[PDB]
Amino acid sequence: TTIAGVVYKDGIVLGADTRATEGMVVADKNCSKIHFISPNIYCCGAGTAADTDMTTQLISSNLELHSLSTGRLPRVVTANRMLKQMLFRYQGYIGAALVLGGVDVTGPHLYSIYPHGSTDKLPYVTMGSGSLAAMAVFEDKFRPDMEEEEAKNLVSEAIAAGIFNDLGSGSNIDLCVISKNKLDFLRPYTVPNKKGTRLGRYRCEKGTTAVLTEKITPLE
Amino acid sequence: SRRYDSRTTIFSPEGRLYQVEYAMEAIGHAGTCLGILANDGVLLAAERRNIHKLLDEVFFSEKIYKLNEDMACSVAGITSDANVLTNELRLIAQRYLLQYQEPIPCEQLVTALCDIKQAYTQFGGKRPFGVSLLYIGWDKHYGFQLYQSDPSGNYGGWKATCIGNNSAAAVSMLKQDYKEGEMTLKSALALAIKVLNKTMDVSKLSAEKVEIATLTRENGKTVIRVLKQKEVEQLIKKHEEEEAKAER
Amino acid sequence: DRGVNTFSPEGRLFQVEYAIEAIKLGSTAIGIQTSEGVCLAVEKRITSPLMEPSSIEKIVEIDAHIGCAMSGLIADAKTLIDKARVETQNHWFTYNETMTVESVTQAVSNLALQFGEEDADPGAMSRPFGVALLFGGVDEKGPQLFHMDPSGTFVQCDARAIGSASEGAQSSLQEVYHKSMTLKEAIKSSLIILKQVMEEKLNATNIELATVQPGQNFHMFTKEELEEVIKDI
Amino acid sequence: RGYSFSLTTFSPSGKLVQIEYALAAVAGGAPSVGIKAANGVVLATEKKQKSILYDERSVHKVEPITKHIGLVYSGMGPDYRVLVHRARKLAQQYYLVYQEPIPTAQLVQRVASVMQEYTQSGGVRPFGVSLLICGWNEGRPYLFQSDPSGAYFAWKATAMGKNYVNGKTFLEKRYNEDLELEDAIHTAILTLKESFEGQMTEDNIEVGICNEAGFRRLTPTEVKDYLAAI
Amino acid sequence: TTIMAVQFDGGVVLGADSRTTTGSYIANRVTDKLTPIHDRIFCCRSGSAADTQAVADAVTYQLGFHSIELNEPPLVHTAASLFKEMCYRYREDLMAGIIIAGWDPQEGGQVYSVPMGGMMVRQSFAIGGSGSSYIYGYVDATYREGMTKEECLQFTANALALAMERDGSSGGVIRLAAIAESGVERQVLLGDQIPKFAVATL
Amino acid sequence: NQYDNDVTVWSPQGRIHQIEYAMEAVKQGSATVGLKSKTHAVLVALKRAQSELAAHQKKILHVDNHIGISIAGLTADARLLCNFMRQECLDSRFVFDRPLPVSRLVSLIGSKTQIPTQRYGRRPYGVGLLIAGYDDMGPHIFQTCPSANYFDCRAMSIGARSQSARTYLERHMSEFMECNLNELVKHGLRALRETLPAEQDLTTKNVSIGIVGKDLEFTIYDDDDVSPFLEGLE
Amino acid sequence: SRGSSAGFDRHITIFSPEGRLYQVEYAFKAINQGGLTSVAVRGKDCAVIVTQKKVPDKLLDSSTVTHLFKITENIGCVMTGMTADSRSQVQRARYEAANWKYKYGYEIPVDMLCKRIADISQVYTQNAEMRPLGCCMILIGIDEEQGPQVYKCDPAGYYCGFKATAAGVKQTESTSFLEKKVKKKFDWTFEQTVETAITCLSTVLSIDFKPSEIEVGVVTVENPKFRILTEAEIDAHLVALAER
Amino acid sequence: GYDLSASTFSPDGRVFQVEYAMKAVENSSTAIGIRCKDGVVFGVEKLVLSKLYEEGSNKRLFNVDRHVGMAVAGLLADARSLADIAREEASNFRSNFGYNIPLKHLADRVAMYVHAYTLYSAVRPFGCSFMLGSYSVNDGAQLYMIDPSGVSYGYWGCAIGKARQAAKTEIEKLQMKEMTCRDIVKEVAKIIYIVHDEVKDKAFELELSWVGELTNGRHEIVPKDIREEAEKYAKESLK
Ligand SMILES: *[C@@](O)([C@H](CC(C)C)NC(=O)[C@H](CO)NC(=O)CCCCC(C)C)[C@@](C)(O)CO
Ligand SMILES: *[C@@](O)([C@H](CC(C)C)NC(=O)[C@H](CO)NC(=O)CCCCC(C)C)[C@@](C)(O)CO
Ligand SMILES: [Cl-]
Ligand SMILES: [Cl-]
Ligand SMILES: [Cl-]
Ligand SMILES: [Cl-]
Ligand SMILES: [Cl-]
Ligand SMILES: [Cl-]
Ligand SMILES: [Cl-]
Ligand SMILES: [Cl-]
Ligand SMILES: [Cl-]
Ligand SMILES: [Cl-]
Ligand SMILES: [Cl-]
Ligand SMILES: [Cl-]
Ligand SMILES: [Cl-]
Ligand SMILES: [Cl-]
Ligand SMILES: [Cl-]
Ligand SMILES: [Cl-]
Ligand SMILES: [Cl-]
Ligand SMILES: [Cl-]
Ligand SMILES: [Cl-]
Ligand SMILES: [Cl-]
Ligand SMILES: [K+]
Ligand SMILES: [K+]
Ligand SMILES: [Mg+2]
């Protein structure tokens, strides 16, 4: 996994690759790693896949209950607190490593959240087995107050660095762009990897497979 | 606090349980509900109380509930209380299936729920559930079956029975017309309509005002169906044709 | 209606006073302590010739050296008797010695006022026990008879009657008792008194009798041994 | 500790009078109306709003449960807030397991089950509210009522609170199956006008609508627009 | 990490490096390790980032509530006591070496150490974190009784710079805070502003 | 009336009838007397026998080497409270390796017995105690009540016709501090004897004695062992 | 019906035949036992709370007699009714606010704090074993979007936001005075907020106050921290009023 | 009837069980507190119901912390229970926060515990009122009083029990703001003697305690010789 985020002039850009692995085998070529928190807040997940899914779903749900009650758009700090307090309580046993970004009444905010419950509020962050490749791109090229398209270029460059240099990362680049005015969930943003084509045809005709027993059960 | 406790689970001086007796008065006022056992199946027929013009019609019935693959029930009395009990019936039936990997036999499901009702009359200081139930089913031990239970946690098996409004009158009509060992689903259907026609004496009988469900066996499988309104009106027609024959 | 732990204006617990009145609905039992042992005698109160008289057990062994006679609501006595049995066995287990009659009586008597409806476990005791008990036995103090009632008050007695005719029987006991009385005299005296107070004609099947002596363990009299003692009486 | 005995019990005639009396609290509440159109549902209610001093926007009687389900009531407002909170929680619990918004009828069944509890459980009275619940799922609108007993019913149109008997007959002589949502909003407001007393403004009625796009309250400006004809 | 605080007449100076590490990767190069607990009470955090954040949040909550109830600013000693209670009670489950410093109207500028294990001691100045090993000598030779605020700031910045040069586990920028009756003044020393001492070449 | 069945119900006069009723349990018990000198604390108790053939109820109980009690009221409540006292004394020796001071034990009783007077469905303790003890502050006599109040006493009597005993004790209390042990016990017996009907006298069957002091652990005297104290009431 | 009663419906919170809760009604009478009245008013720039301060006893330390309470730095309140109940409700509010900030990372909105206290009060109207609190809470604070807020909750668990409101003995009369005054005002909003509050209280009581007979609390958009006026500050307002 | 439970309001909004508990305090003999320039002084009219009791028996003055005294009226077992609650609260505060509990905070915490016993059928209200007194250089002299409803206020002078009003009118005559603890003890004794009804209740002990600059902020019994001088002054002033 390579996940990343940046604060740009008017918002947040989040990024992620789409590979999931089991050991050193690709289990999913098109996993979605950028998760809905609220209409103005999204969260990339790295680490144990069930833990990132379930943790983000739970917090999203509790935040919807919160916003239904308040009648207001949620704050990024609130998602951050809820996540970190739960992860701390579980002592690192919930293997969710998160990049949380959104835009609230106080503007854009980006946090990295670790499994043991520490968080860092920063203008750019990376996580996953590809995170140092992605961070090299950011250290070399980040500038404050980038325009939307510059920020999008930078995030996809960073994800690409992880895709091509980390065996844990691959397939497509997804981005999520969040501003006061707009949410662009770009899945896929880029498809830099493509399966090669098949050269021979193995279209096996009926009767190729020998059959011992057959039962047809008709349905309504 | 002893001053406010109405003491729902104690005996009266004649060995009676007043809350149980009072719950039974509630049931007597609810929609009439009958069950009739035949050779090839079992049926439930119930008076609907949800009959205002502006109601919407969203479920497949009002008072008939599927309990598991092989069983259904109908209820007379407090509706919200019925929803609690029928939810509990479904749970009991799935707990059995989980444990034994076969369907719960009908009498065992009835008894399990009756033990819950009984507990509410003996301890805990709560009001009993204000519900009587008719249960129809098939199992591999006794085939087609009909049971009745009430808020005392008592039950019995029946060839035919009635709960709710005008029960006593309904049972007399069944006593006289029911042929032990000789009923079919088609004649049990005729008899059900005859009985409801007499016991809904406020006033003229209509398909909008009754609900009928049948339980049968087809190709080694139990089929539980709620009759469509077309079929109910046809049976009402046949009963009215039949009463035209009654003299000459 | 008031709670079960309500005091009356005279400083008594209503429930306990009422439980004491239930003892008067019981059959009469008698205990006598002599230097040669204690005896316990009880009226069975047979209500049908179809009833098996041996199924009425109002005298029970607690341990080899201790018996117990009961009167009042007999079903209530079962948990008290079982507590007495368990306690004497615990004491044996722990200390490798027999428990004194006084100590057994004390252990049972500490159950007495443990009732009530807002201190205790989900379904703890709702009321006192409608039972009175005579514990008769022998320990290193010699022979001993103790009485206990539903207040949890217990006391040693030289002779005591309990149940329906206990006034009556207690008066005859004052008349006949003496400190140097033999066990055989005590046995006869208690059957003479039961004979007076019983509604039915006394015989060898409608009474029970037991002894405990320094030589000898708890002993229930057989039909044949009762008949022997009944001849003179 | 808590009283562990029921405060609702059967009378000799077989009535649960505490539930009847809870229904009288509902009957004396402010009027509410729900109409199921062909393409949506409208919920409308009168504010028991005296003073100009009230900030009308500060609390709402018409409330979202989910993106696609909303509620109104007649009876006791604070009891209603309990049920709103539990309904929202029930909806989220469903979503976490099934990853699908709760069907309207499933939400009504679970909420009605909570109301039933308060008719039997120890040391509590029943809720003094009836709920009207609207939703859209399986491409189709739903309108339900849930009463203080925990009984629920599906309606094409209904009225509750003060003067409800009349409101039901007003709707009986006025609703049709093929009616559109915009027409339905109009007849809902007319139903409230039948028993209003005060002169209607956009500040003392509240309107919610439900369609394929979801559940939402109408804004003061939208209600003002519908009020110009009325 | 290197953390430090120093008392002067009327207040305190606090300082920290800005490095968060996992092994020898720098996960944050501009960490803020000086966290406000109340208007004039800060803590400097070292050890586990998760643990010290959780504990600082909990103490902020406790102290805030306490302060509203009493209707008075809290004592620096109270803040330190709350840290100590939590760090001592949970000493087997936390990795936290804390300095609490601040100002209150009753006792003025105060510095408390709560090292791992959860003891508490007041000090004229305190140092902590793994980088502190390398500056014990420096601070012992350079400390003078009666330093002004401006001297405490220089003393702190110098000590931290030296630690940061030698300790792989410390670095980045120097964050400083001065606390007094008039309020809190924060600043960052970066790049060329960090005090500089030659590498001793031949 | 509506105010007398629950210990949680204040009457409109600011009283709690259930507590007052519990105090009647002590007034109807058989009398007991407690008194002290500079060096000893003594308890004297009349024992009631049900019939002529019953032993006579125990009235005096051992608590610890330095503490004993005399009881009046419900016997089962007396045992429950005595067991609490015993346990508090054992705890103090276990923890601190020294006797529990008598005034601290009495405080613990006050605190324990107050609790059920304030909770619904509980009742007061229906027992009154006289407590004799000796510690670093010398001899003590304390009295405890069903109200959970307690009193530090020069001497005291509780139970039936105890007013007479109290009148004797007031009359002679200026003598107690300087009494030898024999004189002090004699005074206890004469006070108790004032509680009796004119016909009847103190005997070895109906008197029980408890003594503790500087040189003497708490000791109970019954039956033939009370005779030395009864002879020479001359 | 019309004041009918069955069973225990005047002793515990069960429904009367008309669907009333008499025990809740009686908790409102308990609010007036104290004999005091409070007023609160909001404008575009501030919100204010004014209440009577009665110190009949000379031996009281009058600095300890107050009905104004800080809930958080930015939320103030005035309590009306039974004093010990009021203090308990203030403690609860303080706890709820602090807990909100800890869990969610931002200050509790005034409307949410008022709702939470109202929801807690609701429980006492549905559960039989405890009474309602015989007190009423008025909260003031600045909301970053909506400006100054005034919220009130009561023993029935009702709550609402207000342009202005009152509590206690002269609540109804205060409501009429405030109603009549706002109708006159353009865009139905108060402008001279501290003067409206004090004038209202002084009219409905007929008193003409000394600066020691009232307490005043404020929050403003420029200065959102809850502040209690001193005697001299209050006196300046009383003198400025007296002179037109 | 509307007066059997603290969980029931009467139709006029009263809680009669709390009022009845107040009547128990008002049947009790009188306790007073007076704050002055440099401390707080307590006095109690302690009725001696039997000559068989020891001097000192049934104290109505308690140390609840080293710096805090408590003076009580009403049902004495209830008051002792409250003193234990006050002690536990002071102890817990020191353990958690690391310094001596401020008087006002202690008063407020115990008052909330009293208040909790005024809401429920499960328990009854405390039949006692009590005063809390302290002194320190930072906080000065403080005197609080708490009643069975759980109301808590601060005072210059305070009286509880049956001659409360007569005591208050005598307390109002003192310029206590300018007097010292040594001056005030004599005036406390004087006032107790004035309000004591020597016909109706025959015998009493005067109980005195203080906390102030002169005790270094420790709550202490007034020494015996100073008490006797104050009594002698009070008695002769009665004349
Ligand atoms: C990612 O961290 C990736 C993120 C995950 C949210 C897809 N993690 C995984 O693929 C982990 C790494 O162990 N694998 C699993 O949790 C097993 C479940 C995968 C099978 C599918 C049912 C999801 C990277 C960098 O670890 C990917 O290599
Ligand atoms: C500091 O002690 C520093 C202080 C901390 C409060 C920022 N501690 C750390 O950086 C610690 C390791 O000691 N790191 C963490 O807690 C890990 C946080 C993120 C974990 C994932 C990246 C796996 C110094 C001296 O230790 C800093 O080197
Ligand atoms: Cl945070
Ligand atoms: Cl199934
Ligand atoms: Cl099945
Ligand atoms: Cl008997
Ligand atoms: Cl209960
Ligand atoms: Cl909610
Ligand atoms: Cl949803
Ligand atoms: Cl909405
Ligand atoms: Cl950190
Ligand atoms: Cl350390
Ligand atoms: Cl450290
Ligand atoms: Cl470190
Ligand atoms: Cl760094
Ligand atoms: Cl006795
Ligand atoms: Cl007894
Ligand atoms: Cl007493
Ligand atoms: Cl007595
Ligand atoms: Cl916080
Ligand atoms: Cl204005
Ligand atoms: Cl008083
Ligand atoms: K370094
Ligand atoms: K209630
Ligand atoms: Mg850890």
mmCIF file of C-alpha atoms in Angstrom, chain G residues 45 57 63 71 108 156 164 175:
data_model
loop_
_atom_site.group_PDB
_atom_site.id
_atom_site.type_symbol
_atom_site.label_atom_id
_atom_site.label_comp_id
_atom_site.label_asym_id
_atom_site.label_seq_id
_atom_site.Cartn_x
_atom_site.Cartn_y
_atom_site.Cartn_z
ATOM 1 C CA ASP G 45 -23.778 41.825 19.183
ATOM 2 C CA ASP G 57 -30.040 38.287 55.935
ATOM 3 C CA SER G 63 -20.427 37.321 47.384
ATOM 4 C CA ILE G 71 -20.456 26.441 32.439
ATOM 5 C CA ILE G 108 -20.118 22.228 22.812
ATOM 6 C CA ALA G 156 -40.672 18.776 31.353
ATOM 7 C CA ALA G 164 -35.595 36.905 24.701
ATOM 8 C CA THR G 175 -42.996 37.516 28.231
#
